Amino acid sequence: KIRIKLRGFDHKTLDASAQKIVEAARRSGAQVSGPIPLPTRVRRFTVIRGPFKHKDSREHFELRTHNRLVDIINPNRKTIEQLMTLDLPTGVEIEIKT
Amino acid sequence: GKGDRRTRRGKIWRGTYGKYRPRK
Amino acid sequence: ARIAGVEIPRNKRVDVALTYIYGIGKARAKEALEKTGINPATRVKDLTEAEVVRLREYVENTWKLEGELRAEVAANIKRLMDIGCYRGLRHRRGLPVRGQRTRTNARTRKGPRKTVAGKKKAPRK
Amino acid sequence: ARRRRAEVRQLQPDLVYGDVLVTAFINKIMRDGKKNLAARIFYDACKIIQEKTGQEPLKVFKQAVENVKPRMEVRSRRVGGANYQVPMEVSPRRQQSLALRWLVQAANQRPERRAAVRIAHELMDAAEGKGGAVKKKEDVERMAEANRAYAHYRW
Amino acid sequence: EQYYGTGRRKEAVARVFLRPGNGKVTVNGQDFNEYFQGLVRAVAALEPLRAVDALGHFDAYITVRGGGKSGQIDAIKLGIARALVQYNPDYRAKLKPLGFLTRDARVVERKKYGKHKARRAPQYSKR
Amino acid sequence: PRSLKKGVFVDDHLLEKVLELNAKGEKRLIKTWSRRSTIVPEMVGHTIAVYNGKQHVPVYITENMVGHKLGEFAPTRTYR
Amino acid sequence: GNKIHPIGFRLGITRDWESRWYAGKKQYRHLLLEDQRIRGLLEKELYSAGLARVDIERAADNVAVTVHVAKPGVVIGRGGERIRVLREELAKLTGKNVALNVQEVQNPNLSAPLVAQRVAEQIERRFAVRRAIKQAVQRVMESGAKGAKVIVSGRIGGAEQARTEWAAQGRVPLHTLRANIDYGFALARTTYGVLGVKAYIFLGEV
Amino acid sequence: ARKALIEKAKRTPKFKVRAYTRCVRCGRARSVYRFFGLCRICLRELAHKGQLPGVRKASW
RNA sequence: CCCCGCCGUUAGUUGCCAGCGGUUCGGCCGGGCACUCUAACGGGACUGCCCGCGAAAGCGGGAGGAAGGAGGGGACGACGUCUGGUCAGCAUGGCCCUUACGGCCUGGGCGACACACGUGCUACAAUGCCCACUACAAAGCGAUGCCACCCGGCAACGGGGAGCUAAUCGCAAAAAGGUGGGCCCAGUUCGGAUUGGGGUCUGCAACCCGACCCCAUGAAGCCGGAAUCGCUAGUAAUCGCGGAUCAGCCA
Ligand SMILES: [Mg+2]
Ligand SMILES: [Mg+2]
Ligand SMILES: [Mg+2]
Ligand SMILES: [Mg+2]
Ligand SMILES: [Mg+2]
Ligand SMILES: [Mg+2]
Ligand SMILES: [Mg+2]
Ligand SMILES: [Mg+2]
Ligand SMILES: [Mg+2]
Ligand SMILES: [Mg+2]
Ligand SMILES: [Zn+2]
């Protein structure tokens, strides 16, 4: 029951790096509950294209944030003894509850 | 009409609540 | 009939009828029917004289109604006309009083349009 | 339509008479996409065509349409002089549309309060050869025949 | 034990479980008409059965989630048609030419900028 | 139909000024720029010169006006 | 009036973000501001290094600049006695321990911000624009490269009526995304007003 | 704007309800998307230089 | 490249009279992921198949298919034009001000009204208005916050106070719709302008110049001259919901 919500701006660098946080085995060294899709949250900016008048111009900007879950049962400290320097995603941010 | 402040319809439009459209 | 001074509203539902009185509306109608116990629905012509009295005795003896209102309102306005008040001035000129715009769109207080000339030397208008 | 011929859209059939003339008619009653009460009107009007005439409404309805379909109509043509009411044939697809419309418009000039009433009474009068719709029809063919002199600019 | 098809329509999804029997239909823990009460179109969600002669040969338990009632009415008409075909694949040639098997791609069109309303162009003057 | 729920705001640099003009006499003309300030009963009698954007104006405060606002008597705009 | 930004148009594919970290809504705002004072310090001091892009990555509080330059010399200095003054000027404003790097941009003639920077430089030294441009296209078109383009705006020649001088060869397919087209823009303050220099460099497809 | 009007810098701005935003990048006081502290132009310029992470072009 | 349409692989603190057990009959609990869904990655459409015309490209039609010839919507705007727009977003040459063309305040103005137009809103009603009950959305936003649920209050709202860094709590009611009831053709139970009065909130501060609530008031308007605008299908038309900016708000 180590709950670890993982989010960032790039879905390739999440699912890849949440795949990396499954390493006592696929289900043969701990347990594992599969990385959970968990919906994304899309903040949107719309902006008048030119600098002056031209009300009806406009161009749309979004900033999507994708979130994954993981969740492991049997929080044995042997397997935990992998969360040392074992990473490589930069613009991912990590959260941990139990 | 949506212009009569003291109707149901009229409250919904102005996104308010009151005597003529209680909250819950 | 004769529920407020001179006010004879007839033949409609009693709650509608009372609104034919001056200081009386959808609200005070609903109210004065509750507080005197008369069914809203009954037609005015189908009313016990004993009920028309409990009405009159209430409505007439419980709010400023008819001319007795129109009187106060009129002197209520002259009141802020006598003093220098800003709303008084607006009343005096006959312009909006609740901070509305007057460049366009003041017709209801201004009255019908007093149209004037357009140009002396300019484009087509 | 500058290119292709624009095909007629095939409407689905009626739910109570299996007829696509009926769906055409319920559509022209419908305003603002309120289709529910448009049926709710037409069908209510249908159970007034029996409760006043033993014949079942579906014949009375299609009988009424037939009296309103026009056989000739004018449509103004620009000429090297001015404008000319020119009498034309009326494609059978356009007779359909013209009669259904005029029915629902004449129905709502009627002074009856409930709407189903208006449609019923208009459906009956039409089927009976009178009522407002059949005027603006005998009224159209009139002009087609009144401008027979120009029936030689037939587009 | 039963027979199943999904079926969607314009942001509305139907879950159609067919069981054998009488004809009795229950959407969202409610009788058919308890739900679609007095909506002239409702009867049409069952046209798959009405055209395979299955009137009173099947019961149906349905849950529907999304959009509005007229869209749900179509999503059911698929769910019923789809379950009826994993029940009997020979039913297609019966059912396909009526189209009941074609999910209606028609969806609300997006709102564009400088329009009022996805196509409704704002009104202009002097031209 | 106006507001200020409990507190009845009155600009106080003027208030300490007027209250202190009631140890004795009532100075003719008081130069305020706080038209923002509610009138109170303890102002009857004096003469306050409210600004304008352009000029102080001799607003003889009576008692008919004990509730209003100072800027309600210094009209801002000039019209015909 | 037309025509997007070819980078802003590809930021999802065949080009990535000049700073690629993450933050909630309480932080993003400031991280960006700092993020930009970095680029502003790094573009005044490091001008003569000839820097193309300035990548920033943040993570556990920290930072991580990766200054891409043409001649990594002038950022290193005497054995290292320059890259530490900057790494210290940085961690000054960034109270968060910065981690400077240097990436060898081989080929100054294939990174568009450089190509453009160069042409704008000549313009301030009063060079021949028409030629300046035609040359840079060549200098780029030789150094590998499937196509390239260069635009100077106007006041070409101190001319009183602003012009626009052009020049491009090979393919430069702006409307195709499968492209990979570095874009660079150089300003060119001159004695008589400014001039804009845009460099386009198409290099490979998929 | 006027450089003197980046007296928005008044971390003590007397009454609180005089606070106002201003684009951190070009001073622009109007249309100042507060998630970014950037105004509507600076917002688009930076977005095209890829310098706001995770900020794509939107379309649907 | 994105989104929407059918299908799969992976994925089960959202989803279930699927199938069982337990029921405070709430997916509530045990339980399972099959389904719906969530979001990553694939498949799938190519005029490939069929008949007809064609020299070919293709055109017509027919199968099968969720979809058939560009399936539907976006992003995307060539060499150039308008000496178009913008020195007030930002840069920038030149020119000018330099105890003032710079700066700080407090008050006013940008909201002035005899008029004229653009864009809109709300209407002129019965396919309607009102009240009660009852049902189906998508997309969003929230901890100087969203505020369930209680108490005062006709109400705005005050007091109190749970959950929620949020597929998990809240904004949240969707509204047209459906059942019942009222109105009865009327300037009306249509319309809600105007004005009088009393009040809540945000803010140092609501006179000029705020929104909201309640009482009274209840204007013009009975479908609009000449003219003129939009839209070809989930489109118009109509119905509500959300967000950016933002103390609050003239939306
Ligand atoms: Mg605009
Ligand atoms: Mg009303
Ligand atoms: Mg516009
Ligand atoms: Mg400046
Ligand atoms: Mg502010
Ligand atoms: Mg293209
Ligand atoms: Mg100009
Ligand atoms: Mg203005
Ligand atoms: Mg009428
Ligand atoms: Mg079109
Ligand atoms: Zn800015």
Swiss-Prot record, chain B:
What does this protein do, in the record's words? Binds at the top of the head of the 30S subunit. It stabilizes a number of different RNA elements and thus is important for subunit structure.
Keywords assigned by UniProt, alphabetized: Ribonucleoprotein, Ribosomal protein, RNA-binding, rRNA-binding
GO CC annotation terms, alphabetical: ribonucleoprotein complex; ribosome
Under the subunit heading, UniProt states: Part of the 30S ribosomal subunit.
User: Which organism does this sequence originate in?
Assistant: Thermus thermophilus (strain ATCC 27634 / DSM 579 / HB8)
Family statement: Belongs to the bacterial ribosomal protein bTHX family.
The record ties this protein, via InterPro entries, to: Ribosomal_bTHX (IPR031414), Ribosomal_bTHX/bTHXc/bTHXm (IPR030826)
Q: Which residues form a coiled coil?
A: none
Gene symbol here is rpsU
| Region described as Disordered: spans on this chain | 1-24
Name of the protein this chain belongs to: Small ribosomal subunit protein bTHX
Q: Which residues cross the membrane?
A: none
Instruction: Please name the GO terms that the record assigns under molecular function.
Output: rRNA binding
Stored Pfam families? Thx
| Source organism superkingdom | Bacteria
UniProt feature, compositional bias: Basic residues? 1-12
Swiss-Prot record, chain F:
Alphabetic keyword roster: Ribonucleoprotein, Ribosomal protein, RNA-binding, rRNA-binding
* Gene3D superfamilies in the record: 30s Ribosomal Protein S19, Chain A (3.30.860.10)
GO-annotated molecular function: rRNA binding; structural constituent of ribosome
The Gene Ontology CC terms held by the record are: cytoplasm; small ribosomal subunit
The family annotation for this protein states: Belongs to the universal ribosomal protein uS19 family.
Keyword set includes rRNA-binding: yes
SUPFAM superfamilies membership:
Ribosomal protein S19 (SSF54570)
Which InterPro entries does its entry note?
Ribosomal_uS19, Ribosomal_uS19_bac-type, Ribosomal_uS19_CS, Ribosomal_uS19_SF
An example GO biological process term is: ribosomal small subunit assembly
Subunit structure and binding partners: Part of the 30S ribosomal subunit. Forms a loose dimer with protein S13.
Q: The organism sits in which domain of life?
A: Bacteria
User: Per its record, how is this protein called by name?
Assistant: Small ribosomal subunit protein uS19
Pfam families reported for this sequence: Ribosomal_S19 (PF00203)
**Function statement:** Located at the top of the head of the 30S subunit, extending towards the 50S subunit, which it may contact in the 70S complex. Contacts several RNA helices of the 16S rRNA.
From Swiss-Prot, chain G:
User: Record's InterPro entries?
Assistant: KH_dom, KH_dom-like_a/b, KH_dom_type_2, KH_sf_prok-type, Ribosomal_S3_C_sf, Ribosomal_uS3_bac-typ, Ribosomal_uS3_C, Ribosomal_uS3_CS
Of the GO CC terms on this record, one is: cytosolic small ribosomal subunit
Q: Which terms does the record give in the GO molecular function aspect?
A: mRNA binding; rRNA binding; structural constituent of ribosome
GO terms for biological process, alphabetical: translation
Domain KH type-2, which positions? 38-106
The record's keywords, sorted A to Z, are: Ribonucleoprotein, Ribosomal protein, RNA-binding, rRNA-binding
| Pfam families hit by this protein | KH_2 (PF07650), Ribosomal_S3_C (PF00189)
Source domain of life: Bacteria
> SMART domains, alphabetically?
KH
Recorded hits in SUPFAM superfamilies, A to Z, give: Prokaryotic type KH domain (KH-domain type II), Ribosomal protein S3 C-terminal domain
Keyword check for Ribosomal protein, yes or no: yes
Protein role:
Binds the lower part of the 30S subunit head. Binds mRNA in the 70S ribosome, positioning it for translation.
> What family is this?
Belongs to the universal ribosomal protein uS3 family.
- State whether it acts alone or in a complex, and with which partners, per the record: Part of the 30S ribosomal subunit. Forms a tight complex with proteins S10 and S14.
What is this protein's record name?
A: Small ribosomal subunit protein uS3
Source organism phylogeny: Bacteria, Thermotogati, Deinococcota, Deinococci, Thermales
From Swiss-Prot, chain H:
This one is known as Small ribosomal subunit protein uS14
Q: Which GO terms describe its molecular function?
A: rRNA binding; structural constituent of ribosome; zinc ion binding
| Gene name of this polypeptide | rpsZ
Its subunit composition reads: Part of the 30S ribosomal subunit. Forms a tight complex with proteins S3 and S10, which cover it.
* Organism for this UniProt entry: Thermus thermophilus (strain ATCC 27634 / DSM 579 / HB8)
What does the UniProt function comment say about this protein? Required for the assembly of 30S particles and may also be responsible for determining the conformation of the 16S rRNA at the A site. Binds 16S rRNA in center of the 30S subunit head.
Q: Which segments does the entry list as coiled coil?
A: none
Q: Where does Zn(2+) bind?
A: 23, 26, 39, 42
Family indicated by similarity: Belongs to the universal ribosomal protein uS14 family. Zinc-binding uS14 subfamily.
* InterPro entries on file: Ribosomal_uS14 (IPR001209), Ribosomal_uS14_bact (IPR023053), Ribosomal_uS14_CS (IPR018271), Ribosomal_uS14_sf (IPR043140)
The question of whether rRNA processing is a record keyword is answered with no
One GO biological process term is:
translation
Of the GO CC terms on this record, one is:
cytoplasm
